[PDB]
Design a protein around this nucleic acid. Sequence first.
RNA 1: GCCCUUCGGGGCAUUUGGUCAAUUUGAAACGAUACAGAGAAGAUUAGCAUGGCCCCUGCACUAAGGAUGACACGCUACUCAAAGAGACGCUA
Lengths: 339, 48, 248, 94, 108, 196, 122, 48
Amino acid sequence: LVRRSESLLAQPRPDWHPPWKLMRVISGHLGWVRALAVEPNNQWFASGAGDRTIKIWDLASGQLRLTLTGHISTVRGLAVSPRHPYMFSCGEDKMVKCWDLETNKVIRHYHGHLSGVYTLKLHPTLDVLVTGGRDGVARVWDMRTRSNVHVLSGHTGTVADLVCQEADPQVITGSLDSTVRMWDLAAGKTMGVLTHHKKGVRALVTHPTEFTFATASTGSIKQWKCPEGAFMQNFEGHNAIINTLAVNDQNVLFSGGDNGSMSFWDWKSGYRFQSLDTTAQPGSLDAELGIMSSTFDMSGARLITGEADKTIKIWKEDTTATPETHPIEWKPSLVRRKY
Amino acid sequence: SAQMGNNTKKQERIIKIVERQRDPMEPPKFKHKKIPRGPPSPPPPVMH
Amino acid sequence: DFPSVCENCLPENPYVKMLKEDYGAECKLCTRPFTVFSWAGDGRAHGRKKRTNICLTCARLKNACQCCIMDLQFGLPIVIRDKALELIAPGPQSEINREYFAQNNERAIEEGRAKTDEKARELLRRLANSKPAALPPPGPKDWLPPADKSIMSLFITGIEDDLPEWKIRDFFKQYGKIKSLVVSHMTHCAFVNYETREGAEKAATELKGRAVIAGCPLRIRWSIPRPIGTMNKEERAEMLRDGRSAFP
Amino acid sequence: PPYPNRAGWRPRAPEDFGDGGAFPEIPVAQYPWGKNDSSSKSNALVVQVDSEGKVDYTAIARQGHSSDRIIHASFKDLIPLRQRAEAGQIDLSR
Amino acid sequence: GTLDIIETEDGEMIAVDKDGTFFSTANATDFAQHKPDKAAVDRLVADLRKAEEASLKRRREKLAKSGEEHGDVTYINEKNKQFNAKLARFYNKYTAEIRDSFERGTMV
Amino acid sequence: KEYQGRKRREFEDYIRRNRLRLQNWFQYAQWELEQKEFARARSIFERALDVHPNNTQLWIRYIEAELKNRNINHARNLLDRAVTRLPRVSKLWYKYVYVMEMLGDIPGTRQVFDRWMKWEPDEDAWNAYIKLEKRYGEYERARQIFAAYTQVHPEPRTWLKWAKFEEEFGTADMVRDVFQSAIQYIAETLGDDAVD
Amino acid sequence: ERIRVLNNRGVAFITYTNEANAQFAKEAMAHQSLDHNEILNVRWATADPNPLAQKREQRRIEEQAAEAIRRALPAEFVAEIEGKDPEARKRRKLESSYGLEGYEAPDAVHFARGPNAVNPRG
Amino acid sequence: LAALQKRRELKTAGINIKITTRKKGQMDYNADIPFEKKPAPGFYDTTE
RNA sequence: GCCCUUCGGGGCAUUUGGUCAAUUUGAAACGAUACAGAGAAGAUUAGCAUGGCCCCUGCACUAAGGAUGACACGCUACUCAAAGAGACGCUA
Ligand SMILES: [Zn+2]
């Protein structure tokens, strides 16, 4: 039998975080909001929806600055460059567009995806964008020459998520074939495969200060440690298709569930300090309750969620909350926890 | 080294290798063949 | 970036001027484009520009020089080596399977994956234990010249399959000019047609109805030339016994 | 036999060597595992053992992969790192 | 020499194991060298063939029981018959009232 | 040979047309088994394993097809590969212990069960291992299996199973020790309140 | 070497001792006349299905390879390898002892060529 | 079927007429194993 | 050949060329001819896709066509049982 640790320090005691509450709901999109991108100076954010428009909203007012057209299918990705005045969109129409924000016009196309594109990440230090789609491939594109410099193959399902970080593993692709692949960017080779999830991996995120990441499939979130992909912990209790995941600079994991569910977790301990259920915009069906995309702003004080009732919901953490009003209900249980 | 029977030590060689002059007008010489995909890398254990 | 070429294919000059052409030709085995290295042989001022005929991967699979396509351990052709040593020939020889195997194995073939030595000794030991009413003795009428001057043929019986035609030809070349020599090893028959009757008469005089060529006993007679047709196994056996009985 | 001496005793049996090992004292050719008249000619894998001592079965999961490839192939990979026995301080810094 | 036979102070033959190679053939690298006899391999092949013949017998019995025309006919083909049987097996508990209405030739 | 070529062409065209249907691979491999082309059938099954790596049915049929032609070592390598790829499918483990119990080889079955118990399975595999060791005498080794079982599955049901086993095959002091260890462990992990 | 004339069919199979002579004859007699105005179809022969011809060709391949191996190996080495000579057999028994009696050294160790081998080497 | 009976009838009548179904764009399935994937070796020797 | 010279001698110039010219036997493509005859559960039909060891035309390998270009329409045991009676009989 593999030995466990009986020190009772393997379970960190959760830090206290205030609960989150609804602040805003922004209408105007005529499709499910599936993209969201806060610009690096925290002034505006970018929503892409099923009405194939990209809308630029002021973050402070929630007030519609601009609408950009040019896609013909649902916008799935969006990225405001911190080093260039560029925005990056991908869609279900196989198009990966680079928008010049100084002209509000599409200036580049990154062509080569055989099907609709679901994800798009900018490399934090290199001049590279990464897309994944329904063709089972993560395309790694050079920004300047529009050249598909890497074809990351090995997944047998739709590549649904992807993260770029500055150290190896530089690409992490979660796919609907229930596997997660860790990719060395320099060679285009799989460093590792994680097959712990039973269902299609739909959400990934990386921690801002720790060298760890998290993956999420239905009913299960798993925290892993880079660069070896060692299984760190489970986030448990969100029995839904999890589309999204948002960790904060203050260690908050946000899982949004396709049935309209929400879980706010403490990152280090795995404790669920909040469990919410979103509400639908009037006129919606019960089936239209669902958080389809989410992000934090650069401050981390606002959670932006795009939801399948075509809405934008801003969430603030409660300023009138103290550790006495919302006590941590976690105890160091002594259970085998059959793995 | 020694090859084709005999095992006498042949003198070592200095070889000048130059790229061949190619006709600038020559089109591509060979057709492109559509070979099916090879098998993938050996799949990992399923850690459910 | 360097060919694998044997010494006898390389020039006698220790200083080799070599041309290199990326994708200059398709390999003569797998039909893939490969870097061709070429050089001028010791036959100065006319001949053939010697070159690497096969690619390096096929040269690792066959263990052969890229120019001559012979075995780089004994100097034998690849098929001769494979038939006489019973080797695996590690790779498909079909059309599409060749590119499939080369596409999927080019990194392990380079490292020597996917040494005969002992099988050569096995072949040598196997060839060590190789295992490959009678008519009266010939009277004088067999080698006496007939009265008919038109009779020219010399009939030989008792020929085994191990005896080539050329040994008979230069055994009978010392007696005169041979117009024709027909050797049928299937029927153990032979016909010698000279140009002058003096040579055939000398052959009958110094053969005297008997001959030994390379340890094979044969019987010689005068004969008018008749064809050899589809002939019975028992008759073949009895004149083989007669050719053995040429030396009682 | 013990070893203050072994002269005058020839190994005649395959079990005369104990488990095995030819005796240097006897100046006769000795075969602890019989005739190697034929080669090994076996396509099996090299059987290894782990630290505590059991047959190591990670050569099957790692078959066809390089050494830098990360492959999870045991139940120990399903345990959290904090609870994973020989695990004290874990460095979680960029 | 792996197993050690000792006549103890009670006069009984004990057999202690230095390694763990005797109990389970883990740590015993000669687990590959086990060769099953002819009878056991024949038993295994016979049992696998018995499972095969059971599968053929069940297939034949299912086809024979599906080859009976007991009841009202609605289909036109064999696949149509199987699909209509599946439609029955799901939709009787929701559509028996409609079937009653069809049988009577009157009220819903 | 014309019939073989036409059947191979038809099977390969069905495989190229729809490779995600297991019936084409199964039919091609079974047919090539029928003309005793074992290398060809092995190649077809391995290509199917390249298309369907984690299919338990394909693994089961390929181990069975290897076994019914009396290729024991091939099929044991195949079962090692199958329990390496899918360690959480109890069907493959159950077939593997059943096959190496059918062929004699009780220490081999024991080491396969030891690997399975290393993977910490459900209670059914522990009960199967205890039944294996109880069938061929060997009660003390079943006692260590109950020790590992009560570590892995520390429910009162497994402690009562150990109590019944030590009642039938051991002294009453062993039963008292088993009950005392059960109540002590459940008192120190679920607290003094949650003893069953 | 051997001409087998399959008469009645009008077909013959000429086997020269040299391959270059065979190619020369094929390129010389193609579309020629023998005695009357005919066009000869001198083409490359396939393989004689006669098992006697098959074993003849297989054997000839085997002594061609044996000639190459005998050229490769030293004369004493090959003379011990066949062992048809009894004196060579006695030399193998006496030489492949190296002090230890009852050895009869393996062919990998005895018939080995190199600077560090333990043999007269080469 | 009709080609089979006429081939058998002409096979009985002495001559051995060669039958060819080698169209262009066609792969050979009888020469070697198509896309041969040998089984992975394990701990058990399988050469016998 | 020429140049230099202390007539002893020395200097300048330095290895081309994947091509047999030679069409039967180192590999072109049809058409005519005969034959079959354009998909969506009655008949007649506009289409757009999907999959790749199927292509053609095209600069288009980020058009549009080639009958919606053709092709697909097949074949079908195996992760595989449990009951409670009765019973030629087995058997405790
Ligand atoms: Zn050469």
